[PDB]
Ligand binder design. Sequence first.
Ligand SMILES: [Mg+2]
Ligand SMILES: [Mg+2]
Ligand SMILES: [Mg+2]
Ligand SMILES: [Mg+2]
Ligand SMILES: [Mg+2]
Ligand SMILES: [Mg+2]
Ligand SMILES: [Mg+2]
Ligand SMILES: [Mg+2]
Ligand SMILES: [Mg+2]
Ligand SMILES: [Mg+2]
Ligand SMILES: [Mg+2]
Ligand SMILES: [Mg+2]
Ligand SMILES: [Mg+2]
Ligand SMILES: [Mg+2]
Ligand SMILES: [Mg+2]
Ligand SMILES: [Mg+2]
Ligand SMILES: [Mg+2]
Ligand SMILES: [Mg+2]
Ligand SMILES: [Mg+2]
Ligand SMILES: [Mg+2]
Ligand SMILES: [Mg+2]
Ligand SMILES: [Mg+2]
Ligand SMILES: [Mg+2]
Ligand SMILES: [Mg+2]
Ligand SMILES: [Mg+2]
Ligand SMILES: [Mg+2]
Ligand SMILES: [Mg+2]
Ligand SMILES: [Mg+2]
Ligand SMILES: [Mg+2]
Ligand SMILES: [Mg+2]
Ligand SMILES: [Mg+2]
Ligand SMILES: [Mg+2]
Ligand SMILES: [Mg+2]
Ligand SMILES: [Mg+2]
Ligand SMILES: [Mg+2]
Ligand SMILES: [Mg+2]
Ligand SMILES: [Mg+2]
Ligand SMILES: [Mg+2]
Ligand SMILES: [Mg+2]
Ligand SMILES: [Mg+2]
Ligand SMILES: [Mg+2]
Ligand SMILES: [Mg+2]
Ligand SMILES: [Mg+2]
Ligand SMILES: [Mg+2]
Ligand SMILES: [Mg+2]
Ligand SMILES: [Mg+2]
Ligand SMILES: [Mg+2]
Ligand SMILES: [Mg+2]
Ligand SMILES: [Mg+2]
Ligand SMILES: [Mg+2]
Ligand SMILES: [Mg+2]
Ligand SMILES: [Mg+2]
Lengths: 119, 121, 161, 154
Amino acid sequence: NVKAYELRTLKKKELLDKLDELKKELSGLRISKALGNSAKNSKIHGVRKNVARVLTVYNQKRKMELRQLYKNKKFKPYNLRKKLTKNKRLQLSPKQKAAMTLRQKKKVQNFPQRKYLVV
Amino acid sequence: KFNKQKSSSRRKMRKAHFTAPAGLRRKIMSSKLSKELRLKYKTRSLPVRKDDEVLICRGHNHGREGKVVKINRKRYKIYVERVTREKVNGESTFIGIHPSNVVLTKLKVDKNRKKILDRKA
Amino acid sequence: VAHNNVLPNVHLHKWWQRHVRVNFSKNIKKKKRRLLREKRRKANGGTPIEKLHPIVHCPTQRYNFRTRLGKGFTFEELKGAGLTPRAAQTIGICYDKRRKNRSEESLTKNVERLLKYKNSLVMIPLKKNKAKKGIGGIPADADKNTIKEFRNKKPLLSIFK
Amino acid sequence: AVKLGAGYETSAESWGTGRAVARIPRVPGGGTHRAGQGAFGNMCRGGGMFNPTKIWRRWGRKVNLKEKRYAVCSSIAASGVTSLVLARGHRISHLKEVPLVVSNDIESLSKTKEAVNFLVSLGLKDEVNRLVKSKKIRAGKGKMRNRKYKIRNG
RNA sequence: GAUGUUAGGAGGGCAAAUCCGCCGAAUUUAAGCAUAUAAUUAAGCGGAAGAAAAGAAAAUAACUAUGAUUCCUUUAGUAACGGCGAGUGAACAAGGACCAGCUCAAACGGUUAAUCCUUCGUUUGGUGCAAACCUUUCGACGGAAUUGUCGUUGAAUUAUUCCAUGAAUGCCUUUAAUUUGAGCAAAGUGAGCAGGAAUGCUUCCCCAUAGAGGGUGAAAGGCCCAUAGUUCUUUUUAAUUUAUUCAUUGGAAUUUUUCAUGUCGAGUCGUGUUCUUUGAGAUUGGAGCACUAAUACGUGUGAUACAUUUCACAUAAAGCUAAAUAUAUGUAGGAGACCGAUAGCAAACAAGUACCGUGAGGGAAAGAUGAAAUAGUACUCAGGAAUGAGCAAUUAAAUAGUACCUGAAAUCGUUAAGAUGGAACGGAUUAAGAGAGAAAACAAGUAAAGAGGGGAAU
RNA sequence: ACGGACCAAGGAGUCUAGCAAAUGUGCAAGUGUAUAUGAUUCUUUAAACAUUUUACGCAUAAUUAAUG
RNA sequence: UUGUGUUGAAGCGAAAUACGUGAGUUUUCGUGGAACAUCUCCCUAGUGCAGAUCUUGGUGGAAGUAGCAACUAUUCAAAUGAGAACUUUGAAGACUGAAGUGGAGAAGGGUUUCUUGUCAACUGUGAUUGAACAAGAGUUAGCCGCUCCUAAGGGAUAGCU
RNA sequence: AGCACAGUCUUAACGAUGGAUGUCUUGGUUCCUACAGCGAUGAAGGCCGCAGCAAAAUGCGAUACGCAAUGAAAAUUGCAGUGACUGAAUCAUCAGAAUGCUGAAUGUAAACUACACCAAUUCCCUGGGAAUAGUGGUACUCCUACAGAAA
Ligand SMILES: [Mg+2]
Ligand SMILES: [Mg+2]
Ligand SMILES: [Mg+2]
Ligand SMILES: [Mg+2]
Ligand SMILES: [Mg+2]
Ligand SMILES: [Mg+2]
Ligand SMILES: [Mg+2]
Ligand SMILES: [Mg+2]
Ligand SMILES: [Mg+2]
Ligand SMILES: [Mg+2]
Ligand SMILES: [Mg+2]
Ligand SMILES: [Mg+2]
Ligand SMILES: [Mg+2]
Ligand SMILES: [Mg+2]
Ligand SMILES: [Mg+2]
Ligand SMILES: [Mg+2]
Ligand SMILES: [Mg+2]
Ligand SMILES: [Mg+2]
Ligand SMILES: [Mg+2]
Ligand SMILES: [Mg+2]
Ligand SMILES: [Mg+2]
Ligand SMILES: [Mg+2]
Ligand SMILES: [Mg+2]
Ligand SMILES: [Mg+2]
Ligand SMILES: [Mg+2]
Ligand SMILES: [Mg+2]
Ligand SMILES: [Mg+2]
Ligand SMILES: [Mg+2]
Ligand SMILES: [Mg+2]
Ligand SMILES: [Mg+2]
Ligand SMILES: [Mg+2]
Ligand SMILES: [Mg+2]
Ligand SMILES: [Mg+2]
Ligand SMILES: [Mg+2]
Ligand SMILES: [Mg+2]
Ligand SMILES: [Mg+2]
Ligand SMILES: [Mg+2]
Ligand SMILES: [Mg+2]
Ligand SMILES: [Mg+2]
Ligand SMILES: [Mg+2]
Ligand SMILES: [Mg+2]
Ligand SMILES: [Mg+2]
Ligand SMILES: [Mg+2]
Ligand SMILES: [Mg+2]
Ligand SMILES: [Mg+2]
Ligand SMILES: [Mg+2]
Ligand SMILES: [Mg+2]
Ligand SMILES: [Mg+2]
Ligand SMILES: [Mg+2]
Ligand SMILES: [Mg+2]
Ligand SMILES: [Mg+2]
Ligand SMILES: [Mg+2]
């Protein structure tokens, strides 16, 4: 029934091995079901779940490795890029939006909107 | 009432009650604790668990104490040791009691319960 | 049409039902607006939301005699006050490039108003403590105690009306 | 207000005369029970109601400020007069003076219990009792629309 | 100029209530109809956003003048248009909401493009558990660009005063709000009656910053969840607290005093003519075509075509821009003098479902047992079985038996009573039947003694 | 002459705009606080309250195509 | 406003020495099983039905009536079964009459095929039958097709509108 | 053991039929407030799947009525089975992982699971050792940059 916290520590090969075993077990169960049996029909669900868990663990490991590989370097795969609503991606970064023509900037610096308490 | 984020609206309330998730159900099957228990812990009332020992107050069995057998969050009903009842068949099932109508005496107490008590304090 | 009644003039031959707005939102809208303004005020700690406007005479022969707040003060009036336009803008005062002065008296009045405003206002420093004199028009920055005192007193909004 | 096209969302048209059926618009097509049925029109099941209610009914009424003021004044006067108060239904027989005035100590009362006690002392015990009694569940469909209880006015 | 699966990127489709462009009817009204009207609407086609569009005067005024846009109140059903018929119909001012201004081009800087971008990098930081982010200035190697990037908003020159800036040492304080989820959360499960079961009724208690709402075997402030209230934590944004030394590049505003009188958007405006649109009238905007300008002493508005000329106001033919405003779309909340299952959305239910149509499309019906089926009909008899019956059985109740709450009428059955010669029923009037009935349709009190209840007097 | 086999439920002068008359009500040479603001206004409160320490409407004057 | 309700509300049914000229109101008994009034005043409206070849749903008389007559035709015995004119088997008698109710395919259908069950409805008489209902099963390709070619034609590329 | 003629019509009682009335109500409607776009990083829409016993809807996507993680937190239950004594049974949350075939659909096609061509691709172990015909890519228009040819 193997829960994830055990599996994080395992190396990828070991994980793969585990997964194959689980798959084999599942296949066996399926075969049994197909044949006139209902002894361990309900065992299958758990096995399936276990398999799923294993897959998840492995997938996340793989993703982490990928991320490590493509750390920085301007361009990246579009997977490892910031998946985010298209419009937002298109949109100008806040900094870009801010960026002021030099005269305007100067003006801002000189005559900023002051605080002035009226009495 | 005074905060207008919550709805008084009857319909809405009823929907919430009936269609609540499991956590909500658990929360709203609470029972009054006895005087002794109240004195012991600042708590007035608790969500009822399996091995608590309740005293029934309302219904046909206004008095029969017993260990809670099962709590069933679908129907909002606890069932109690000896509140037995034959069906038309003869099969002896437990009679359901809603936790309004019960007051819990002896307390099932795991770490979670302890934590809850501490929080209440 | 029948009987002795006004000849009917009801412009409802188009699909009028399509654009009827009923103002169920009025009072609530007003409340919301008020809230927003309060928020704005809070954000501008101590300083007034409202901006100085010059009094001006309304045009046309019929409103001639009446006086009301125009937008913006005219370069000449700013000059009289002893004030740069940019500086004025930065403070609470409106500037109007396109308005002109025909009447000396009017100009005098508005510069008087400006002067009064200047007298009223006390300037919070830009970077804390460091009290420095202004640029072109703006007055000096007062010290801390004075500022505190001013804060403790009520913020007068008599000039903005 | 009823939603705009209520009862008129159909494509229905009348078959006209020579079919031995009234000339109400009919739903077209086949297969359903709805096919061939009287469609829009106040008479028909699934029809539009007659003058469907609209948001642009006049809901509020302007009342002259002056009139309102006058009304307020008159109500105040009434509140003054013992007999009128009695008529209005309050159990005021044990209160001395009906322009009933109380010290500013009342404005500082912190606790409902205290307030209740004060009321009792005044003579309104009976009134309070009546109020307590008269929370009852409304007749009719108010019950279904958050108007569950009906309470007398103290 | 083609060409590339070159390196990097972008567009395409969905959705639409508000929104922006086109395109564009007719029913309708005129009691006919043709211009008008419907309507610069519907449909069609395209395009955006949380709003869009508009917007910083070639504006209005004729005043003591106002001063971008938008929106509201109004102006005003007014000026005006119109087979001057039907009907249509603004604008300025005034009062508010909200208020924000700007940068290209042109002028200027050649003792030098100062600009800009791609790729490759380099090394201080900040929050994060990571993931990512956040900024920091520094070069290269490419290109782009003199067919024009960047700075300046005339130019210098003086007096004043600001703003950036870098380093060392220093301070992460107190609150106020504001907005997320968080917990905590007062007082009866007291006697009696009647009930299957109180949340009921008489009665004794209390709590209430909580007597909203829901749940609970019947109406519950005190049984439960929540409610009033408060206690942290999340969001940001005000106030308050600590800055002090030393470096210098650079810029800004006003102020003197010199000299510069510059520049200001062309197949564009404009006129003609056509068509459209407008309230716009010898044409309001727009468009097609023809013709085609002027330089600020210019040209454009100043609602009657023109000339001659004043005066006022603007500075067209490039561009951007928050707010007030709208929202029948979607999602999420919250409300109701709304509807209550033939109503309300078409849809309370496995509803845009079933089903019909080749198809575009059309489009239903259908909720409720009980407190609890963890009470859904055991058992016995008769039956081929369905069912039926029970001395049997769940229930408070089964004529509440899952087609289940109530269970109307039409219609039909049973029984009884009555009538009955080609209608029936009805009205007015009695009668004879057959049912119900005593509150007017008799008997107050007094006496004897039973069963109750009250009130007072001391 | 037409409609009606029967029964149940549904089923038709309504709502807005603007005008008028009638009548009630307030105030009255005025009247209506319009938008909007303000409040120690905030379950109800989308109401109620308030009107800044010469707005506008209709009326108070008519008449003329008109300068008037 | 001042009340009634599980010592039984609304509703409904039948009534009543009932009241009202009348709309109605009121009460009794039964059923019913939870709400209900307010006429104290006035507020509000999707407010009152016999008709509309009204709508919707239901139910009648017609009426146990019309009718269940194309395709020449059935009969006997036995079995199965609660039950057999129309299920099965046998024996007769017949018909289709290779332009066939015969074999194969296309379109269309979509599991109707098949076995085992099986009868609530349906199979307009019956029914144990069934193309119904339920449970399972069943479609095997290098060669049979599609897949490739082009046809009448279609949709596009370039442009051009 | 007897006696009512039958039918038609009427009334009452007690039933059938039907679903009115009344009572409800996880639904609608309206108004108010608030935010407000999804998509070549493959959208909406459509198919096909996915449960031990599984049709619909609901949820999900070959990890398929769910995985991880977080916050609850002892059950889930028709049976089978799985769990507790807290990453576990179940809820909510949902940011990680994953997301079949399509569809703008985009390699050509389309009543095709038809067909190209270019990369062979993928995994494991610290440069080898394993797999699988599997996996990607290739649309049109456009932009910047580069390329070597054209006038
Ligand atoms: Mg309807
Ligand atoms: Mg009612
Ligand atoms: Mg598009
Ligand atoms: Mg006509
Ligand atoms: Mg006509
Ligand atoms: Mg005609
Ligand atoms: Mg359109
Ligand atoms: Mg814009
Ligand atoms: Mg306007
Ligand atoms: Mg007027
Ligand atoms: Mg028009
Ligand atoms: Mg009940
Ligand atoms: Mg110009
Ligand atoms: Mg026109
Ligand atoms: Mg003018
Ligand atoms: Mg411009
Ligand atoms: Mg623009
Ligand atoms: Mg409906
Ligand atoms: Mg009872
Ligand atoms: Mg009954
Ligand atoms: Mg009921
Ligand atoms: Mg029934
Ligand atoms: Mg005869
Ligand atoms: Mg005739
Ligand atoms: Mg006729
Ligand atoms: Mg007829
Ligand atoms: Mg009829
Ligand atoms: Mg009048
Ligand atoms: Mg009633
Ligand atoms: Mg009606
Ligand atoms: Mg009716
Ligand atoms: Mg009728
Ligand atoms: Mg009639
Ligand atoms: Mg009918
Ligand atoms: Mg019939
Ligand atoms: Mg047959
Ligand atoms: Mg023959
Ligand atoms: Mg023959
Ligand atoms: Mg067969
Ligand atoms: Mg048959
Ligand atoms: Mg068979
Ligand atoms: Mg079948
Ligand atoms: Mg072949
Ligand atoms: Mg070919
Ligand atoms: Mg061809
Ligand atoms: Mg073509
Ligand atoms: Mg007889
Ligand atoms: Mg968008
Ligand atoms: Mg998990
Ligand atoms: Mg956990
Ligand atoms: Mg393709
Ligand atoms: Mg083909």
